[PDB]
């Protein structure tokens, strides 16, 4: 059975990184701020245990401010490639560097997927290896800045960390966290996926 996730955030983060983590593959290319800057998603999907893992990484444009003639199309994609609704949106973060462009960059998120949608979004963390082997949940519970508290409150204190450069068993190991998190959101979600009115409007046009 699919689970699907949405990669979010601001760009430069880690997001793509963390989409390859994740599926274990080169799936999504990482890239330095000097770069282009991305319009499309990109979808693609692996396996995890037995279960097909189905993954959205979102445009840069997605943050973008002011008008842009491409963005409604490309969130119309979103939604269609991700329909009938995401199990999980991964707001991504880099430990320590949580600034007013994240939080900017969360609002777009509302915007976009709806007022409701941190209900079913777990904060990701990249750049895990800062913490030098220490509690994640410890740093969070000293750390403070409050716009980021705030954040975390409104997804549930639902926190993950990456280094998406590690590899081998700690690769795993950081992905088994990551899925923890994911079965205990969807257990209090009855197993449900987020779902909203645009969501809805696609699964009625489908028989
Ligand atoms: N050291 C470190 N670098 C990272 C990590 N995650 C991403 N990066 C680097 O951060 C840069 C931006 O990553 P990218 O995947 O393009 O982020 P995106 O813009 O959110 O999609 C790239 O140079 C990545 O190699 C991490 O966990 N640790
Ligand atoms: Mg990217």
Request: hydrophobic share 35%.
């Amino acid at each position: 059975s699919e689970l699907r996730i949405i990669l979010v955030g601001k760009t430069g983060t880690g997001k793509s990184a963390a989409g390859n983590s994740i599926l274990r593959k080169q799936a999504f290319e990482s890239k330095l701020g000097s770069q282009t800057l991305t319009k499309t998603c990109s979808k693609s999907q692996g396996s995890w245990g037995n279960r097909e893992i189905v993954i959205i990484d979102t445009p840069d444009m997605f943050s973008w401010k002011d008008h842009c003639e491409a963005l409604y199309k490309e969130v119309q994609r979103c939604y269609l490639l991700s329909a009938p609704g995401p199990h999980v949106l991964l707001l991504v973060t880099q430990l320590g560097r949580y600034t007013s462009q994240d939080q900017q960059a969360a609002q777009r998120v509302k915007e976009i997927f709806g007022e409701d949608a941190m209900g079913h979004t777990i904060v990701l963390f990249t750049h895990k290896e800062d913490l030098n082997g220490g509690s994640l949940m410890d740093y969070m519970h000293d750390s403070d800045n409050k716009a980021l508290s705030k954040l975390v409150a409104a997804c549930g204190g639902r926190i993950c960390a990456f280094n998406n450069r590690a590899e081998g068993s700690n690769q795993d190991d950081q992905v088994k966290e990551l899925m923890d998190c994911i079965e205990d959101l969807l257990m209090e979600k009855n197993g449900d996926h987020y779902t909203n009115g645009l969501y809805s409007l696609i699964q009625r046009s489908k028989c």
